[PDB]
Amino acid sequence: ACTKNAIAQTGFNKDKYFNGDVWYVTDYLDLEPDDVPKRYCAALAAGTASGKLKEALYHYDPKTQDTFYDVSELQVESLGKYTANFKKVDKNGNVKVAVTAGNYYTFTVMYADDSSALIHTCLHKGNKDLGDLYAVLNRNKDAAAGDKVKSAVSAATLEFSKFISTKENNCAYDNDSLKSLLTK
């Protein structure tokens, strides 16, 4: 179960965040820590496509090779806070699992600049019990977390030392599929 009402960044710049480009997860923190593996690869694209607010997601477990993509349509709750319904797709956007009620995530941008961001999600997926997930993002898949985003982690009353890095997993990403999936 989730327990946090994450606070959106004051002055969040939606057009900059949702610019159609790719964000990589470099570090994450799951408050129900055994809900997710200790080794993982994740990235997203975020943008407006034909007037609709979208995300394209990519998950990869580098040990099991479990892979999945999703396309999300986001509804606005308040600036920097969204509710997203998702459909699982192949990398070309063909639907594998349709949008369903009960399958959604909240998405809150707690901090962002041009290069880095801190987000919170609460995933809901059928009768699974999932928790609060925080993720440090960067535009550069190899960027170490800088002071701006680490300070934001502190300002959320979290400890960056507890976040798990994705950097030693040899993660490789298909940016082209993420960008094209925004349209799907």
Q: Is 57 in the site for ligand XE (CB under 6 A)?
A: yes
Give the H or E element holding residue 133.
Answer: strand 132-138
Rounded CA separation 137/29 (Å): 12
Note whether 43 binds ligand [N] by CB under 6 A.
no
3-state secondary structure of 155: helix
**Integer Cα distance of 162 and 27 in angstroms:** 10
- Applying the rule CB under 6 A, the residues between 134 and 173 that interact with ligand XE are none
Min separation Cβ 133 and ligand [N], Å: 5
Q: Is 4 helix (H, G, I), strand (E, B) or coil?
A: coil
**Residue 109 lies near ligand HEM (rule: CB under 6 A):** no
Q: In whole angstroms, what separates CA 45 from the centre of its chain?
A: 9
Amino acid code (one letter) for 121: T
CB of 136 to ligand HEM, least distance (A): 10
**Which amino acid type is present at position 22?**
V
Any contact of residue 136 with ligand HEM (CB under 6 A)?
no
Residue 123 engages ligand [N] in binding (rule: CB under 6 A): yes
User: CB burial class (10 A; 0-12, 13-18, 19+) of residue 32?
Assistant: middle
The residue among 160 and 173 lying less far from ligand XE, judged by its C-beta, is 173
Nearer to ligand XE, 9 or 121 (CB): 121
Using CB under 6 A as the criterion, what x/- string covers residues 9-48 for binding ligand HEM? ----------------x--x-------xx--x-x-x----
Would you count residue 4 as binding ligand HEM (CB under 6 A)?
Answer: no
Q: Is 59 annotated as a binding residue?
A: yes
- In angstroms, rounded to a whole number, what is the distance separating the alpha carbons of residues 154 and 80? 19
**Contact residues: ligand XE, CB under 6 A:** 42, 44, 57-59
Binding residues for heme: 59
